[PDB]
Write an enzyme that holds these catalytic residues in place. Structure first.
Site, PDB file in Angstrom:
ATOM      1  CG  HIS A  68       1.400 -13.648  74.120  1.00  0.00           C
ATOM      2  ND1 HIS A  68       0.022 -13.673  74.174  1.00  0.00           N
ATOM      3  CD2 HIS A  68       1.771 -14.783  73.480  1.00  0.00           C
ATOM      4  CE1 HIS A  68      -0.421 -14.779  73.601  1.00  0.00           C
ATOM      5  NE2 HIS A  68       0.619 -15.472  73.173  1.00  0.00           N
ATOM      6  CG  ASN A  69       4.568 -12.372  80.537  1.00  0.00           C
ATOM      7  OD1 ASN A  69       5.172 -13.435  80.649  1.00  0.00           O
ATOM      8  ND2 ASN A  69       3.378 -12.163  81.089  1.00  0.00           N
ATOM      9  CG  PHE A  70      11.495 -12.495  79.878  1.00  0.00           C
ATOM     10  CD1 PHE A  70      12.300 -12.729  78.771  1.00  0.00           C
ATOM     11  CD2 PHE A  70      11.929 -12.929  81.127  1.00  0.00           C
ATOM     12  CE1 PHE A  70      13.522 -13.387  78.904  1.00  0.00           C
ATOM     13  CE2 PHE A  70      13.146 -13.588  81.271  1.00  0.00           C
ATOM     14  CZ  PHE A  70      13.944 -13.818  80.156  1.00  0.00           C
ATOM     15  NE  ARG A  71       6.723 -15.005  85.742  1.00  0.00           N
ATOM     16  CZ  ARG A  71       7.694 -14.961  86.651  1.00  0.00           C
ATOM     17  NH1 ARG A  71       8.355 -16.061  86.992  1.00  0.00           N
ATOM     18  NH2 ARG A  71       8.031 -13.801  87.198  1.00  0.00           N
ATOM     19  CG  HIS A 108       7.753 -18.272  70.666  1.00  0.00           C
ATOM     20  ND1 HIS A 108       8.196 -18.342  71.968  1.00  0.00           N
ATOM     21  CD2 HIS A 108       6.403 -18.376  70.719  1.00  0.00           C
ATOM     22  CE1 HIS A 108       7.159 -18.491  72.773  1.00  0.00           C
ATOM     23  NE2 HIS A 108       6.059 -18.515  72.041  1.00  0.00           N
ATOM     24  CG  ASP A 109       4.972 -15.260  71.582  1.00  0.00           C
ATOM     25  OD1 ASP A 109       4.460 -15.047  70.461  1.00  0.00           O
ATOM     26  OD2 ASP A 109       4.559 -16.130  72.385  1.00  0.00           O
ATOM     27  CE1 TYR A 240      -6.004 -15.475  73.928  1.00  0.00           C
ATOM     28  CE2 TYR A 240      -7.908 -16.905  74.250  1.00  0.00           C
ATOM     29  CZ  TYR A 240      -6.650 -16.683  73.721  1.00  0.00           C
ATOM     30  OH  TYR A 240      -6.050 -17.670  72.978  1.00  0.00           O
ATOM     31  CB  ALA A 268     -10.627 -21.044  78.662  1.00  0.00           C
ATOM     32  CD  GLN A 269      -6.806 -23.780  79.674  1.00  0.00           C
ATOM     33  OE1 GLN A 269      -7.167 -23.128  78.692  1.00  0.00           O
ATOM     34  NE2 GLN A 269      -5.533 -24.072  79.914  1.00  0.00           N
TER      35      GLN A 269
END
Ligand SMILES: COc1ccc(NC(=O)[C@@H](C)Nc2nc(=O)c3cnn(C4CCCC4)c3[nH]2)cc1
Ligand SMILES: COc1ccc(NC(=O)[C@@H](C)Nc2nc(=O)c3cnn(C4CCCC4)c3[nH]2)cc1
Ligand SMILES: [Mg+2]
Ligand SMILES: [Mg+2]
Ligand SMILES: [Zn+2]
Ligand SMILES: [Zn+2]
EC number: 3.1.4.35
Lengths: 322, 320
Positions: A68-71, A108-109, A240, A268-269
């Site tokens: 959850h970063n800028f990228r 959004h984040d 996580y 996970a996917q």
């Protein structure tokens, strides 16, 4: 580095764009281009210098989390941008709605900490206490987004009349709060309900469609080319684990899908793709057929590839069994 | 003084209790009594000393507004207390629900600034921006409630298992958030919908009832004897007019029903009593018939009184 090549600017319009190739300033330039390209700077009298400063504050307000970063912020806005072209959303949505979709996507984040809502609540953190356990992260992202816009030098909305501001503010809040996965089943049910007889002139129908769109972009990593999408899983699991580790050395509950001892890159996917991504994009395809070829296809391939990876992973596990 | 007399202890259980006679320390003592009397101290192992510090913190976190102040806090809780006895709520609700109702009532307006949600939103205040325009005041009241309970020296729930805390916290949040009048018709509609065939076993039915219960106590001033109720109207308008003045002064929208140039004491109460109070208490009476005689009668009487006060007012204006 600065100054996007015409090749890049053209690549920016497709979900194949390699999000890893760029650095903050380049991604910021790309975002800037999107606002000019989509006609938002024009139609909303956005001071082009203010547009760049705003983007800078946004970037400064994102944290260096593994995922959850800028990228990630850039991926969602870039994917939203791709959706606009792929589905010719400008034929269905007003510019205001386009402004809302892009801006919410970018914001959004904002200031995400790296631990989800379940942690915030269980650990009774300040955010969970501030928002009374109701989507604490999403409420926070909205607040930060508007605290930023409250600053004159970053107010890309300074030239919009008050009534339009309220409409934009309301729309953004709805979309950002809609990104809370806890409401996934709910929102999908509501959308599939309107879907029986969708009506583009029905504001409530459009509101749900915009919610599904930002949702689609937010978790769209696996829609991208395998080489671009795969590294995100590692980033996700890193974040996580950082949380499940903490929840363990704190006696708080731990989710299996975040458990360092039970989750693999593949497990996970697979489920996420089969029961979250594919179903959602399938519904969306009922409205935009071109979506199936451009986005459902890579999802099918990713699903199959991970199921194969899981078998090799299970094999190695069999060799570790005592 | 802070040592309640037998007479006081008995009067505290009825909606006729004169809330204007006591000072804060006495009201605090009254509240304290309610927690022992209801068995909340026993059933939840509330450290008696903690109960006192907590009440002092709650009191400290209310502001000196003309209406939304500590005494309003007391009226709501005292009215909730009255209701528990009048309707025999301990026969219908668990001790956890009684705890939720009592604690929510006490904390429902914590740190209220004296200006409603519309002002927060239109002035784009820190609170409105923090809560994204969603019931900013109520969300805040609830946040402060738990910020206080988070302090170990005020945590009256310190001896409650985690699962209990969560169930209580969720309950209080629901009830405090339900006090936003913007949601009044919505909540009334859902309740009446359930009321078509109420079921005390149905948790969703009980959640709505609790919501209605706290809502009733919150705006229950006119249920109280004329002499106790009358002063509140003045505190109400004082606060209302302080907001509309400020809005005029800052060039913000002004709500006619809060406008100093259009509101009279009678017009402020007539519609409120006839269309908000009475209808809501009428539905509750369906479940608790004893409410009609104890709470509706005072309401019909106030209605008739204010309707008359209005004809007189109109005749006076006309005479000029
Ligand atoms: C239904 O609510 C849910 C919330 C989180 C998850 N997470 C997952 O299933 C994990 C194990 N896998 C996953 N793969 C993805 O590519 C992806 C993208 N975003 N996310 C998460 C969605 C919540 C924020 C991060 C993903 N999760 C799954 C469901
Ligand atoms: C339908 O929702 C509404 C919300 C507020 C009002 N307020 C009024 O009608 C005012 C003028 N009168 C009034 N009388 C009261 O006894 C009373 C008690 N509380 N309140 C208000 C309830 C909201 C907070 C203050 C009252 N308002 C009226 C309707
Ligand atoms: Mg998020
Ligand atoms: Mg209130
Ligand atoms: Zn996101
Ligand atoms: Zn109140």
């Amino acid at each position: 580095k600065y100054l996007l090549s015409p090749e890049t600017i053209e690549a920016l319009r497709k979900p194949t764009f390699d999000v890893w190739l760029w650095e903050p300033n380049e991604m910021l330039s790309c975002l800037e281009h999107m606002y000019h390209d989509l006609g938002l700077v024009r139609d909303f009298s956005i001071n082009p210098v203010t547009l760049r400063r705003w983007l800078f504050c946004v970037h400064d307000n994102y944290r260096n989390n593994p995922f959850h970063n800028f990228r990630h912020c850039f991926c969602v806005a870039q994917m939203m941008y791709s959706m606009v072209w792929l589905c010719s959303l400008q034929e269905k949505f007003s510019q205001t709605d386009i402004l809302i979709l892009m801006t919410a996507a970018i914001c959004h984040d904002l200031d995400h900490p790296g631990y989800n809502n379940t942690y915030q609540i269980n650990a009774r953190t300040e955010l969970a206490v501030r928002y009374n356990d109701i989507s604490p992260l999403e409420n926070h992202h909205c607040a930060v987004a508007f605290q930023i816009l409250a600053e004159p030098e970053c107010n890309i909305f300074s030239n919009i009349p008050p009534d339009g501001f309220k409409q934009i503010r309301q729309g953004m809040i709805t979309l950002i709060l809609a990104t809370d996965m806890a409401r996934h089943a709910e929102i999908m049910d509501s959308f599939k309900e309107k879907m029986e007889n969708f009506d583009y002139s029905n504001e409530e129908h459009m509101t749900l469609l915009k919610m599904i769109l930002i949702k689609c972009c937010d978790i769209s990593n696996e829609v991208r080319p395998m080489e671009v999408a795969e590294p995100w899983v590692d980033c996700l699991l890193e974040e996580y684990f950082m949380q499940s580790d903490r929840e363990k050395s704190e006696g708080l509950p731990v989710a299996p899908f975040m458990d360092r001892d039970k989750v693999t890159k593949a497990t996970a996917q697979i489920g996420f793709i089969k029961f979250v991504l594919i179903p959602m994009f399938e519904t969306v395809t009922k409205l935009f057929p071109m979506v199936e070829e451009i986005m459902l296809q890579p999802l099918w391939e990713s699903r199959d590839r991970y199921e194969e990876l899981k078998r090799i992973d299970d094999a190695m596990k069999e060799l570790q069994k005592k």
